[PDB]
């Protein structure tokens, strides 16, 4: 039995190796009889042009529909018959394909990921079938006010840049995208130096690496020099997008200022600040007694059904703010208290509320890295974002050094007298005017 500090050192350091083609291979060994292994790629809609926006998402629909070695439902049958799980996700900057399986099945799992990542069929008839599946998913997503409002937030905050694009792409692209667009996209983006084979669980790094050499060696490490897709910074614009629809029962509002970007040290203090304000929803047991002033006011005065702060990071920018859902007559009050809270943290954060935020953050970090999948993902994404796995002991040091002064200074830096980006959807007649929202920033 150890103390909290002692336990941080209990963590097995993550092992990293690199194949000649430049693919990074990283793993974290545990005693788990199951594991998660996958490929994380530096590819997402932020890399897409208006013409092929939606390509990566389209590819996601094809990834598991058959390979050259395992056509049709063959790949499917193999994953299912060994009791494994195959998943995928695409964001604006990252794409991942991962498998959950018995540790003993690691060799087959790595072989299948390799087969998927290099020999995907992309059959013409499959492509046509997926058009309709994607079009139906776009209709479904239209009914998710939270997804709509966050895509709207990105559309206005990053208007005129690749980050304004949704991951799914515009319906017209889904109708027109050709196999050629998809192969051109995959050709330029799926390169060894932009990928990370990650694994977490009961396995050894040496076996992982040998399987890497065995199955990913032929993975291209060079598109050439005329391609090397490189991201330019994306301008943030203080702005507002309001989609009024009084036919919907509750209003969704998302507001954010420009955040620092993945690798910035400031993210730790911002996370502490966001933990102080926190999240909330009508089913929380706390009520009037919640520590967060926004949460207690909200609960006692019935200002919203829910709210959550957020810190969405991208390479050299991001969205720092909050989202809330409320009745048409509570929007102004919610905005008033939310901005009052940002302002109070900039000028008056207290040591005790900051320690509380630090404690909330510590707990969130460690409880999130529970299970092979979350750890595997942290490995894959971290190598892409920070270029290394940052150990818990390091996060602890970064957290420990945050105090009230640091919180005031970092919050002031990003929130104080800065233009926010605002997105609203639903019965929003009461959403404050942008000038009024802008004056609330000071």
């Amino acid at each position: 039995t150890a103390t909290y500090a002692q336990a941080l050192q209990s963590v097995p350091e993550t092992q990293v190796s690199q194949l000649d083609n430049g693919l990074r291979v990283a793993s974290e060994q545990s005693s788990q009889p199951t594991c998660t292994v996958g490929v994380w790629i530096d590819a997402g809609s932020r890399y897409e042009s208006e013409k092929n926006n939606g390509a990566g998402y389209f590819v996601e629909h094809l990834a598991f529909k058959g390979t050259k070695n395992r056509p049709g439902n063959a790949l499917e049958k193999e994953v299912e018959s060994m009791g494994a799980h195959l998943n995928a996700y695409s964001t604006r900057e990252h794409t991942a394909y991962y498998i959950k399986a018995l540790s003993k099945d690691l060799p087959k799992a790595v072989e299948l990921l390799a087969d998927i990542v290099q020999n995907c069929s992309l059959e013409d008839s499959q492509i046509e079938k997926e058009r309709d599946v994607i079009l139906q998913e776009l209709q479904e997503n239209d009914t998710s006010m939270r997804d709509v409002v966050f895509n709207y937030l990105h559309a206005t905050a990053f208007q005129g840049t690749p980050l304004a694009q949704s991951v799914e792409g515009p319906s017209e692209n889904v109708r027109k995208l050709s196999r050629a667009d998809l192969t051109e996209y995959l050709s330029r983006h799926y390169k060894a130096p932009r990928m990370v084979l990650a694994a977490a669980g009961g396995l050894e790094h040496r076996q992982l690496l040998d399987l890497a050499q065995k199955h990913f060696s032929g993975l291209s490490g060079t598109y050439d020099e005329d391609a090397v897709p490189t991201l330019s910074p994306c301008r943030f614009t203080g702005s507002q997008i309001c989609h009024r629809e009084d036919g919907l029962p509750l209003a969704h509002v998302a507001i954010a200022v420009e955040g620092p970007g993945w690798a910035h040290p400031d993210n730790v203090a911002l996370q502490v600040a966001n933990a102080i304000i926190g999240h909330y929803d009508c089913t929380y047991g706390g009520g009037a007694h919640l520590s967060s002033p926004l949460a207690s006011i909200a609960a006692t005065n019935k200002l919203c059904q829910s709210f959550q702060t957020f810190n969405i990071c991208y390479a050299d920018t991001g969205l720092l703010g909050a989202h809330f859902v409320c009745d048409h007559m509570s929007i102004d009050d919610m905005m008033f208290v939310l901005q009052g809270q940002w302002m109070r943290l900039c000028t008056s954060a207290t040591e005790s509320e900051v320690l509380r935020g630090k404690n909330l953050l510590r707990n969130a970090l460690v409880s999130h890295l529970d299970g092979t999948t979350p750890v595997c993902e942290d490995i894959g994404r971290s190598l892409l974002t920070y270029g290394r796995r940052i150990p818990l002991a390091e996060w602890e040091s970064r957290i420990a050094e945050v105090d009230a002064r640091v919180v005031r200074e970092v919050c002031s830096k990003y929130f104080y007298d800065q233009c926010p980006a605002v997105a609203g959807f639903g019965p929003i007649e009461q959403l404050p005017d942008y000038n009024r929202i802008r004056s609330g920033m000071f």
Partner: peptide
């Protein structure tokens, strides 16, 4: 907290105001 430094510039403003204005 920030109140001293802000109370001190509010302090100064009143003073310079009176001084000048009066």
């Amino acid at each position: 907290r920030n109140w001293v430094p802000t109370a001190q510039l509010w302090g100064a403003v009143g003073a310079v105001g009176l001084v000048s204005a009066t």
